[PDB]
Amino acid sequence: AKHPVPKKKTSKSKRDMRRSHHALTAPNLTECPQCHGKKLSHHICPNCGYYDGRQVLA
Amino acid sequence: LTEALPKTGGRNNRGRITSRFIGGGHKRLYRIIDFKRRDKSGVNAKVAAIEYDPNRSARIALLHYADGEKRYILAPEGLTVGATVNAGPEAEPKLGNALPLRFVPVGAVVHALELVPGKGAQLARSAGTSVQVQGKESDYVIVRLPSGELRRVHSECYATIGAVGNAEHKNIVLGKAGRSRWLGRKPHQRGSAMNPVDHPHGGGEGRTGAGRVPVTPWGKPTKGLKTRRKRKTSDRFIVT
RNA sequence: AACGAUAAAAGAAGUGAGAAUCUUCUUCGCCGUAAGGACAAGGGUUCCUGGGGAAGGGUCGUCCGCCCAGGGAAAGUCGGGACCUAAGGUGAGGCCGAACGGCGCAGCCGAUGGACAGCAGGUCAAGAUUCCUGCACCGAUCAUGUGGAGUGAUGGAGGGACGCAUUACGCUAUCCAAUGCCAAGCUAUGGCUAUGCUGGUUGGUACGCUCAAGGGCGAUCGGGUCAGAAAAUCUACCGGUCACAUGCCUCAGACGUAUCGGGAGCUUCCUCGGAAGCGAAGUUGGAAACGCGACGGUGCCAAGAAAAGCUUCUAAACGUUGAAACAUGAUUGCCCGUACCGCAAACCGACACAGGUGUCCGAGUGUCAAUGCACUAAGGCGCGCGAGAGAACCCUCGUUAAGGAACUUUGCAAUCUCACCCCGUAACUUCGGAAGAAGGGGUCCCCACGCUUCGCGUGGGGCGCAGUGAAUAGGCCCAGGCGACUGUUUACCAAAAUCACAGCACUCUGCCAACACGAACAGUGGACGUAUAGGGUGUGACGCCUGCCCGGUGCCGGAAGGUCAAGUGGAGCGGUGCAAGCUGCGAAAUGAAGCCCCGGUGAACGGCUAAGGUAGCGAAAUUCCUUGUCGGGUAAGUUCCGACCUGCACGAAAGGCGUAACGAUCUGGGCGCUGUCUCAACGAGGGACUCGGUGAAAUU
RNA sequence: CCCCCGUGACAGGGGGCGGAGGACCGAACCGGUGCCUGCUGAAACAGUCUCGGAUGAGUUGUGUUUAGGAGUGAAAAGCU
RNA sequence: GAAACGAUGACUGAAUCCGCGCGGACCACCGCGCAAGGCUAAAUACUCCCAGUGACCGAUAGCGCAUAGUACCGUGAGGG
RNA sequence: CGAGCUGGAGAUACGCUUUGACUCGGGGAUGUCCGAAUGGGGAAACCCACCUCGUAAGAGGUAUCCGCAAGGAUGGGAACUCAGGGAACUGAAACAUCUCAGUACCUGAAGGAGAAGAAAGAGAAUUCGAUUCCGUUAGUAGCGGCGAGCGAACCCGGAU
Ligand SMILES: [Mg+2]
Ligand SMILES: [Mg+2]
Ligand SMILES: [Mg+2]
Ligand SMILES: [Mg+2]
Ligand SMILES: [Mg+2]
Ligand SMILES: [Mg+2]
Ligand SMILES: [Mg+2]
Numbered sequence A: 001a002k003h004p005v006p007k008k009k010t011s012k013s014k015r016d017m018r019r020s021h022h023a024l025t026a027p028n029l030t031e032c033p034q035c036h037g038k039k040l041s042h043h044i045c046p047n048c049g050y051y052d053g054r055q056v057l058a
Numbered sequence B: 001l002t003e004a005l006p007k008t009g010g011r012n013n014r015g016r017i018t019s020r021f022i023g024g025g026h027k028r029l030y031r032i033i034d035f036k037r038r039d040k041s042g043v044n045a046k047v048a049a050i051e052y053d054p055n056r057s058a059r060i061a062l063l064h065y066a067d068g069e070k071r072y073i074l075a076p077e078g079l080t081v082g083a084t085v086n087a088g089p090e091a092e093p094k095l096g097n098a099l100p101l102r103f104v105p106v107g108a109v110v111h112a113l114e115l116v117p118g119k120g121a122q123l124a125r126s127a128g129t130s131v132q133v134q135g136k137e138s139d140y141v142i143v144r145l146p147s148g149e150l151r152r153v154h155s156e157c158y159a160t161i162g163a164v165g166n167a168e169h170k171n172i173v174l175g176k177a178g179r180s181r182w183l184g185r186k187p188h189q190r191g192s193a194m195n196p197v198d199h200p201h202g203g204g205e206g207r208t209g210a211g212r213v214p215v216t217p218w219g220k221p222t223k224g225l226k227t228r229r230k231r232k233t234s235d236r237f238i239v240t
Numbered sequence C: 001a002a003c004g005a006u007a008a009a010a011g012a013a014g015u016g017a018g019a020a021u022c023u024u025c026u027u028c029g030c031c032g033u034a035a036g037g038a039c040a041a042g043g044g045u046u047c048c049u050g051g052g053g054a055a056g057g058g059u060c061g062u063c064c065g066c067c068c069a070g071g072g073a074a075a076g077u078c079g080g081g082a083c084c085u086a087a088g089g090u091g092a093g094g095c096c097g098a099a100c101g102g103c104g105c106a107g108c109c110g111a112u113g114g115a116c117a118g119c120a121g122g123u124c125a126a127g128a129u130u131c132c133u134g135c136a137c138c139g140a141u142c143a144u145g146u147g148g149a150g151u152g153a154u155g156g157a158g159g160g161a162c163g164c165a166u167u168a169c170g171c172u173a174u175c176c177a178a179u180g181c182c183a184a185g186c187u188a189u190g191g192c193u194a195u196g197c198u199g200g201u202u203g204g205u206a207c208g209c210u211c212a213a214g215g216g217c218g219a220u221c222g223g224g225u226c227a228g229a230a231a232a233u234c235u236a237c238c239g240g241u242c243a244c245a246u247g248c249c250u251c252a253g254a255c256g257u258a259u260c261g262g263g264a265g266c267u268u269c270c271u272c273g274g275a276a277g278c279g280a281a282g283u284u285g286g287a288a289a290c291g292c293g294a295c296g297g298u299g300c301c302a303a304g305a306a307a308a309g310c311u312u313c314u315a316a317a318c319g320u321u322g323a324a325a326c327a328u329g330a331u332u333g334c335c336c337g338u339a340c341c342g343c344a345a346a347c348c349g350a351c352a353c354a355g356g357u358g359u360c361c362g363a364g365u366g367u368c369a370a371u372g373c374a375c376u377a378a379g380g381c382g383c384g385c386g387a388g389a390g391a392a393c394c395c396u397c398g399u400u401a402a403g404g405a406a407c408u409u410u411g412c413a414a415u416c417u418c419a420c421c422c423c424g425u426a427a428c429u430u431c432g433g434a435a436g437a438a439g440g441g442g443u444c445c446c447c448a449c450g451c452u453u454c455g456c457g458u459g460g461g462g463c464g465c466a467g468u469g470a471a472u473a474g475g476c477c478c479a480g481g482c483g484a485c486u487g488u489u490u491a492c493c494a495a496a497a498u499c500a501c502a503g504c505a506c507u508c509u510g511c512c513a514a515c516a517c518g519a520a521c522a523g524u525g526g527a528c529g530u531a532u533a534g535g536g537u538g539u540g541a542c543g544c545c546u547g548c549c550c551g552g553u554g555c556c557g558g559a560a561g562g563u564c565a566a567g568u569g570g571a572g573c574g575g576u577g578c579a580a581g582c583u584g585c586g587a588a589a590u591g592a593a594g595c596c597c598c599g600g601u602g603a604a605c606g607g608c609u610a611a612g613g614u615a616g617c618g619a620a621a622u623u624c625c626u627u628g629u630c631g632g633g634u635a636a637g638u639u640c641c642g643a644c645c646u647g648c649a650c651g652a653a654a655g656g657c658g659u660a661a662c663g664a665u666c667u668g669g670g671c672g673c674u675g676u677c678u679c680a681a682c683g684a685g686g687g688a689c690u691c692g693g694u695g696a697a698a699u700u
Numbered sequence D: 001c002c003c004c005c006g007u008g009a010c011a012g013g014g015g016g017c018g019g020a021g022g023a024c025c026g027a028a029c030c031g032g033u034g035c036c037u038g039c040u041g042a043a044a045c046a047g048u049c050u051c052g053g054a055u056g057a058g059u060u061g062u063g064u065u066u067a068g069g070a071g072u073g074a075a076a077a078g079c080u
Numbered sequence E: 001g002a003a004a005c006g007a008u009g010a011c012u013g014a015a016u017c018c019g020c021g022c023g024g025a026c027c028a029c030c031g032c033g034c035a036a037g038g039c040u041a042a043a044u045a046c047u048c049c050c051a052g053u054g055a056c057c058g059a060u061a062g063c064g065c066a067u068a069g070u071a072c073c074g075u076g077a078g079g080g
Numbered sequence F: 001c002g003a004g005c006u007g008g009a010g011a012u013a014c015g016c017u018u019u020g021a022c023u024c025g026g027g028g029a030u031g032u033c034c035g036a037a038u039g040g041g042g043a044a045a046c047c048c049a050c051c052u053c054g055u056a057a058g059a060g061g062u063a064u065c066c067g068c069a070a071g072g073a074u075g076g077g078a079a080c081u082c083a084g085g086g087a088a089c090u091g092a093a094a095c096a097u098c099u100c101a102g103u104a105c106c107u108g109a110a111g112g113a114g115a116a117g118a119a120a121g122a123g124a125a126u127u128c129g130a131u132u133c134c135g136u137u138a139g140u141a142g143c144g145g146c147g148a149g150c151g152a153a154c155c156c157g158g159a160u
């Protein structure tokens, strides 16, 4: 059959003691030196395309 | 190969199977073969050829009557090709001649014999067979059938001088299996190798051998089967 | 956890509210007897165009086989029908039946078979032997001419009419080669400079004292009554006449000429990529069908549909002035199917499922050959989650020191072997075989030389570790059990010593046969057979064989007597009435089969009191005690082989003993090889882990 | 079938040539033997490797016939 | 069953007025009726359809259906 | 019948309605193909013929069974009626009788109803007096492995 299988429904509680670890970490946004929109450290600013000069197209 | 009706396999009637086994084949055809041979009495003919045909184990003579029509007729042991056949009470009792018993010399070995005027031959026709005459009585003749029997027959019935032959199913050893398949389906199925359900000699843990009966409940060794009827009076010495 | 085969994917560019996931380009990789192409069946619109963007699509989706709308399918000749018949179905009138209904000749329905008039191209977004273009053929109806006369059936005959294997010759489709021909250009990395490179290198029709293998063939006169129900100027039979050779008749196909099409590409515009117009050459050599010539040749036995069309022939018949037939014109041409999927996300499998599906086509190179194997054309496709990581463990692989079955129930598994030449090859044997036995050698490249050519042999030379150098690709042997053999079987745990079998035996069965299906003195199967046949039962090649016991049961035969049914036969007993009469009961003897009784029969049940095991085999797949005892092989053997015999409970057709050959059979031994094992290691890939998307289950 | 050799009852042996076979190896095709895998499967019985058959008692398409105590069955109480 | 009568498949087979059947074997006596030809309203049954009513339901109830024998499942009968 | 109508459909357009639409009653006329189906074939709704009337289009007939002939029959009906054929589970704590039953089912015929019916009757009074239905008699008489269990009729009342 489906060999191992659980012995009892798990508490709404237990089921939550579990998930006490699935909370996303929000990105740590930086503010782009030029167009000042927020960016991702070490990546290119999706709004101006800069990374000191303008790398990506507008 | 010429002028024959087509034959069709079939080993059972309306509903289901009747005569067990028999199913293989080859497609063989039917050749209408003159047995009664009377409407043609009074006309000579010659052995145009002897063709070998199935459904018989008996050579076949392709005779030709002055009339112009041909008619296949069993071939007795002896006729070469080109000899002469003649029907009608007016016929030299020789090989291939058909002349009723009244006109047939005692001790004469003939085949193709009837049992009733017309409706064709009936006794002695399968590969090599010999029914000799015993000695006329009143209207019926005493003859010896290939089963070693004695039956009165009103001499009114024609017969063919001689005995069929077509060689002999003696050395014909059908080689290994499958030859039987060139003809009829896998032979007999040992009912002793079946089930209590399927047949009397069924089940039994291991290997049996009790009661001895047919697929149904009768008996096969030494149990009479013929019944009480007319021919019965017209017969002499069944046993052996 | 999974996202459905480990045939990979990359970049660029485009579209878009949003794209790993759509479109375009350029590469990569996978299939290529297919994962290409054409049908069938089955499904229906799934096809094409434009839109769409809920849900379906195991993830995205701007996309789709999904949703919406519109469009698409075209046939005198292709299939089918208005033609044919097989099994089978049905069936007036017939035979049977409690009903319903069951059978059944002719006839009819009924393909999967028979018969039958077209090809080559073009081309809508989407159809094409259907539309167009060119040229053709068939039937029908009319007119014209020719003709100059019969025409000739629901009837006869001829014919259509038919297997398996193998095989000669010619040919084509199709494929290959070339310093052949035509066309386009360029070539550079080092060289070539074109005797290089790429690509194309004919299909239909019409004529031609052209070439051409192969293939087909009696006509005629007469005779006979008895043959074709009849008739016959037909067919069959008989005989005469010439049918050596030959000869004709026919030409698969090729060649030449013509003509129609196609033809690599070229050119032009361009709304972005199509559209339009034009066009070259077509050689020599080689291979070659499962097709064509043909219903070819030889051989073989298990001995290989019917019916119509068709050809001739009369009956009847209207007509012998205006016939049938040909030709040249014209008019004519019906119904149904024809889109798309179609070995598959479009059919059967609940799912766009690793399965199942009939037929046809199926290129090249290399390799004895091939529809094998490797690579690859055409063409089709990368399989509708993706990215990282590089742990345990799991799956699928590569290599492995020393050893080599020590593993273990068992060398289970996995190695070794592995193709084609040559040499060589045991016991035993039904002389076939055992054999691919076993064992050994070769195998690539260059050159000369000779050979029957692709190819090959001889000699010399050369290179590597190695040359069927990569893929396909037997491990071998000794001995024993069982079964003779090929074969067959428990769809979804048994393939086997099971079943079947050729061979043998007993017995039944006289032919409306025994026997069997059936409501049935119907019908039917046995058998359109007939005892060297058919049914039943058992045994199971071949070989030497196969004993003793018929008390019991059965089967056959005998059969005095005993017993035994209905019925025949009427006395004896009783009833009611006054009576005649009417009414209850009931023998003797007689009366069928069968049962008792007499004998017989074992390849009948069966036994070894009716007898007691002849041969042969024997602790055997049948032996309990038991790993019996001795011998064999092993260092060591409860297994195995050989003997013995005390055969708990072998044994002669529920067959006894043996037996070459065969087995995905079962058992024991050996040689070789090996990761089975001492011990495991390293490596690879696919999961497992991690992130983004979708997101179950049993259980509780 | 055609050639050469042989003889005491013994045969036959040889060479050509022919093309036989429930013959051999083997792919389609039919099957399913052994192991692993897979068993909340890709799959209500499969895949890979391996193996059996491979002109025969062979494999298969279409149409058609037989069924419930009935059919069919190279026979497992199998299949329907 | 002492078991009459009715009925009929099979064999048989009568009378007719000082005639025939029966009245539960059988007889006499007593008694009721006339068989072997026929047609016949009406009260009786059911309920597809219609109207009225309901100490009936009112949407897991009520019919299966507030409508669908549809979707869906099955080769099919069939289920739904 | 009198303002509306133009079906459910919830929409637009076109329109139709006192020389009274529409709607409701009640008769006609049309009524393709299949279906007993019946021109012949047929795997339903398709495919093929023929004769006659004829402008061709188009019309009509073309089945079997009874009868001169008209004219009648084949098919279909939820349940009810009669008839031909007729289970088993189950009970009897098993089971063969018997029970369940002549029920269930199959089939034939028929109608709105059928069936039955005008006495060779039932009954014990020298009574009643076609048939059928309700009440009762009575669970009495009786049947019964006299077990399980099955179960009348007359009289009398009433429908008619
Ligand atoms: Mg991954
Ligand atoms: Mg042994
Ligand atoms: Mg075997
Ligand atoms: Mg085998
Ligand atoms: Mg995730
Ligand atoms: Mg193999
Ligand atoms: Mg093998």
Ligand SMILES: [Mg+2]
Pocket (backbone or CB within 6 Å): none
């Ligand atoms: Mg509510």
Ligand SMILES: [Mg+2]
Pocket (backbone or CB within 6 Å): E065, E067
């Ligand atoms: Mg409703």
